[PDB]
């Protein structure tokens, strides 16, 4: 349910 610290929200 959370975003991990290495998730990339960018293109």
């Amino acid at each position, epitope marked *: 349910p*959370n*975003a991990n*610290p*290495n*998730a*990339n*929200p*960018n*293109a």
Partner: T-cell receptor
Amino acid sequence: DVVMTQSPLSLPVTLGQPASIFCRSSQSLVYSDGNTYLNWFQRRPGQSPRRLIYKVSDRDSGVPDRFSGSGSGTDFTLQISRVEAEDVGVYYCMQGTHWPPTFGQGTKVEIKR
Amino acid sequence: QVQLVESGGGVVQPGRSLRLSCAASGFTFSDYGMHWVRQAPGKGLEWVAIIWHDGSNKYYVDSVKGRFTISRDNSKNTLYLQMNSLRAEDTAVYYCARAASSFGSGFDYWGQG
């Protein structure tokens, strides 16, 4: 939520002298990918806030080289090598390793003149 | 040349709604995720929400889940925060901020709030 404890809360500094701001996290900020997600931010009078440092020690565009970051695990330091008049403001650490990201309370830098 | 400008702040009655906007310029807006962050009396800085570059994922701090909705219109270079069910705890300066390519590194540019 991880608690970020900064010290000191007020930092009076003579122009041209160094300054150190300390941050301790309530849990280690090392992540399983090998990175430590510890960031520093600056708020200045009249300006939008901006990031200064990410991943403990990497410096952002437009940030003078007198700013540097160090530390590991739970303990981190923002260093200003020679404080300038334009560095007055409030400095915040922020951890991003644990959910949700959390900020320290801020350290206010002021110049003794 | 990156610029972020928030608008829509004002008074709102408890339980009612308010929409905030953030106008982006100076970069390719659709290439970047976007955050909201707030600074409330006695709380300091608090991360609020993130939206992916394409709107495909959205995350929220627990206390605003079920109350706030983040959205964006890439063709208009605008980010939105729809705030419903407002609470006294919500009085704050709201900032939008441009996402880092790792969530744990936060965001680099912010608006003035």
